[PDB]
Each structure stands twice: as structure tokens, then as C-alpha cells.
Amino acid sequence: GCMILLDTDIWCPCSHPYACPENICC
Structure with a gap:
């Protein structure tokens, strides 16, 4: 998820x- 649609x-x-993706997953 998160970094994924x-x-x-x-x-x-x-x-x-x-926090935003591309590093941290929420």
C-alpha cells in the first residue's frame, strides 16, 4: 500500500x- 496505488x-x-511515501509508508 501507501507507496502503491x-x-x-x-x-x-x-x-x-x-509522512509522504517514496521513503516513509503511512
Whole structure:
């Protein structure tokens, strides 16, 4: 998921527990 096309939330807010993909998976 996350870094994969699954949820429209793939672009999770950076500098957060979620944080953006391409590195951190939310």
C-alpha cells in the first residue's frame, strides 16, 4: 500500500507520523 496505488491518501502529510511515501509508508 501507501507507496502503491490503493488509497487516495497516498500523499500523506510529510513531517508527520504518516509522512509522504517514496521513503516513509503511512
